[PDB]
Amino acid sequence: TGYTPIDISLSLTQFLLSEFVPGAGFVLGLVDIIWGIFGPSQWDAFLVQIEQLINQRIEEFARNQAISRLEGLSNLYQIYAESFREWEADPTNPALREEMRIQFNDMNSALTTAIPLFAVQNYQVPLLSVYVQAANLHLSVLRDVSVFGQRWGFDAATINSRYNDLTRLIGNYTDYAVRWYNTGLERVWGPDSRDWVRYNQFRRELTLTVLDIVALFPNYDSRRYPIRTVSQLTREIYTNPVLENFDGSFRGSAQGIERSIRSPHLMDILNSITIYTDAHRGYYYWSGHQIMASPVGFSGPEFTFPLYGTMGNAAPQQRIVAQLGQGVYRTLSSTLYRRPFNIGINNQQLSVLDGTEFAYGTSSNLPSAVYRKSGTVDSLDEIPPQNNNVPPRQGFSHRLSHVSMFRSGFSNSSVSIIRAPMFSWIHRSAEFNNIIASDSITQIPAVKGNFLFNGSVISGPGFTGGDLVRLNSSGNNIQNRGYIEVPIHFPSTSTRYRVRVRYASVTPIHLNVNWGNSSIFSNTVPATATSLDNLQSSDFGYFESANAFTSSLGNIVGVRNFSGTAGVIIDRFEFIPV
Numbered sequence: 001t002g003y004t005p006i007d008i009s010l011s012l013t014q015f016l017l018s019e020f021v022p023g024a025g026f027v028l029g030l031v032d033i034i035w036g037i038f039g040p041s042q043w044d045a046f047l048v049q050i051e052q053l054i055n056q057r058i059e060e061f062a063r064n065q066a067i068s069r070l071e072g073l074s075n076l077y078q079i080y081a082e083s084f085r086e087w088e089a090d091p092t093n094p095a096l097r098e099e100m101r102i103q104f105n106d107m108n109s110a111l112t113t114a115i116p117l118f119a120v121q122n123y124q125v126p127l128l129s130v131y132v133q134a135a136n137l138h139l140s141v142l143r144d145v146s147v148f149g150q151r152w153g154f155d156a157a158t159i160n161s162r163y164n165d166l167t168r169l170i171g172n173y174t175d176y177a178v179r180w181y182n183t184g185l186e187r188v189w190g191p192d193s194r195d196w197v198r199y200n201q202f203r204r205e206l207t208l209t210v211l212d213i214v215a216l217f218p219n220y221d222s223r224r225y226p227i228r229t230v231s232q233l234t235r236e237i238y239t240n241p242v243l244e245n246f247d248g249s250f251r252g253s254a255q256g257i258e259r260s261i262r263s264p265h266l267m268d269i270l271n272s273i274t275i276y277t278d279a280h281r282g283y284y285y286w287s288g289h290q291i292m293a294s295p296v297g298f299s300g301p302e303f304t305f306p307l308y309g310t311m312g313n314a315a316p317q318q319r320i321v322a323q324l325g326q327g328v329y330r331t332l333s334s335t336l337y338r339r340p341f342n343i344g345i346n347n348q349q350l351s352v353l354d355g356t357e358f359a360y361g362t363s364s365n366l367p368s369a370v371y372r373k374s375g376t377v378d379s380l381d382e383i384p385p386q387n388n389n390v391p392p393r394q395g396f397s398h399r400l401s402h403v404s405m406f407r408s409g410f411s412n413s414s415v416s417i418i419r420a421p422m423f424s425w426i427h428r429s430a431e432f433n434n435i436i437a438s439d440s441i442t443q444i445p446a447v448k449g450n451f452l453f454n455g456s457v458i459s460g461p462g463f464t465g466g467d468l469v470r471l472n473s474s475g476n477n478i479q480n481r482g483y484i485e486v487p488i489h490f491p492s493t494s495t496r497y498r499v500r501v502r503y504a505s506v507t508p509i510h511l512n513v514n515w516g517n518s519s520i521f522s523n524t525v526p527a528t529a530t531s532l533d534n535l536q537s538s539d540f541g542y543f544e545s546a547n548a549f550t551s552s553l554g555n556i557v558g559v560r561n562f563s564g565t566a567g568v569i570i571d572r573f574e575f576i577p578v
């Protein structure tokens with residue numbers, strides 16, 4: 001059918017983001033999306049997807065052993081799923097209850113045996129995606145026994161033991177996956193542009209097929225999340241048409257290309273891009289541009305970034321409005337390469353864009369914005385739909401969040417000109433606004449805030465689904481306390497909410513949580529980590545307000561660091577309806 005593991009994973013991500021609640025729906029969902037296949041095809045494809053990228057086939061025996069085992073888990077989970085489905089339909093039935101207990105044990109036992117075979121020495125990287133899939137399924141099944149095990153007829157001692165497995169393995173699987181993500185990525189680095197392409201492709205593909213899934217693992221903790229919980233992925237992934245459609249390779253450019261990506265920041269909303277046009281020998285091109293953005297929820301004035309590339313005057317400037325409908329979901333770019341037989345300042349090599357169509361995500365339809373012309377270098381090939389059952393403009397997975405630029409040469413004095421817009425893509429689960437649901441546990445990442453004082457945004461470890469907020473120590477200045485404020489919106493004004501914060505700290509730290517002007521928590525929270533530099537899964541802890549309140553307290557939430565000597569990492573705010 002022409003599908004790749006990337007398509008499949010994005011679809012699974014969509015599911016896990018919107019349907020993360022225990023019950024038959026979840027179990028049947030996993031069968032429908034991943035585990036309902038017959039035969040080795042899918043699994044082979046999952047392996048090839050990473051193998052072809054690192055340019056290394058898994059040793060043949062270990063490869064067949066892994067594929068074979070995945071087939072086994074598939075058959076077994078299909079049976080488990082149907083037993084679950086019939087059981088839910090008739091929960092008091094003793095025969096169904098006994099069958100569930102047997103099915104759970106077989107499933108748990110098979111997964112525990114199978115997993116190390118997806119961690120074979122010297123082949124951890126190409127086996128990573130199937131590992132994560134298996135790990136996901138295992139956590140899922142452990143979550144199921146935690147929620148339903150009593151009703152199935154397991155004793156309290158067995159349930160608690162399985163739950164302790166769940167919490168430990170949330171940690172272990174996460175750390176394993178991130179470690180091997182980092183290792184694999186690092187191996188793929190090289191000095192030239194061809195290397196950078198491969199490196200970024202790895203980052204991109206494994207973000208979509210590994211990291212994105214891992215980021216949702218904490219959700220399986222049924223005690224922490226006893227009802228439906230909605231996560232948001234704020235991380236950005238990258239395409240670059242000029243570089244990615246280039247068959248040659250720019251020597252020693254990789255570092256420069258990588259630096260052209262912007263550094264960690266509070267999430268913004270891309271409003272417009274103003275493109276400047278330069279020309280050479282009747283070839284008109286995108287020479288530079290200017291970005292305009294807004295804070296999350298349009299909760300502040302629009303801001304303008306410094307000029308990217310060079311301001312050319314060969315044609316009038318074109319202001320492309322990105323923020324219409326759901327925003328820009330797709331770029332279709334026209335690449336221009338000039339490689340003349342004789343090269344000189346009068347006859348330059350060009351590696352640029354001479355057109356781009358910017359297509360909008362929309363429930364209906366909306367005409368595309370077009371810089372000069374459309375092209376065939378299509379972002380949808382790299383950033384596919386999460387839902388392939390509707391048109392791409394409805395079933396898209398990402399939204400254009402920024403455009404920066406890798407640049408080389410000056411038109412006036414160079415033989416070779418590179419102008420390579422770097423397109424940055426945010427997952428659509430990163431909503432324009434912070435909207436607190438009334439019937440589910442709403443997760444709002446701290447980086448979705450709009451005001452940060454005595455602190456900085458730092459790179460996530462890779463398992464949080466985006467970046468993190470670091471509040472600095474005050475230096476014993478009551479006026480210099482680190483503060484992050486998040487704008488929030490309540491569609492329901494009568495629902496009562498407890499506010500939970502997910503954090504990391506090396507020493508005990510006094511934190512103050514405000515909802516509007518009201519302080520709803522002010523106390524010392526324990527240390528959770530040994531280091532803030534090398535973050536592992538268990539380094540993140542939780543604390544929460546004692547009481548529940550309504551939207552009448554206000555439309556902001558914040559955390560203040562009262563410590564004079566220690567810093568603290570804020571991951572996300574969570575709103576729990578009582």
Ligand SMILES: CC(=O)N[C@@H]1[C@@H](O)[C@@H](O)[C@@H](CO)O[C@H]1O
Nearest residue numbers: 453477478479480481482483560
């Ligand atoms: C006495 C006190 O804590 N003052 C805080 C200050 O520490 C800082 O957080 C600032 C950021 O806006 O807000 C002030 O209200």
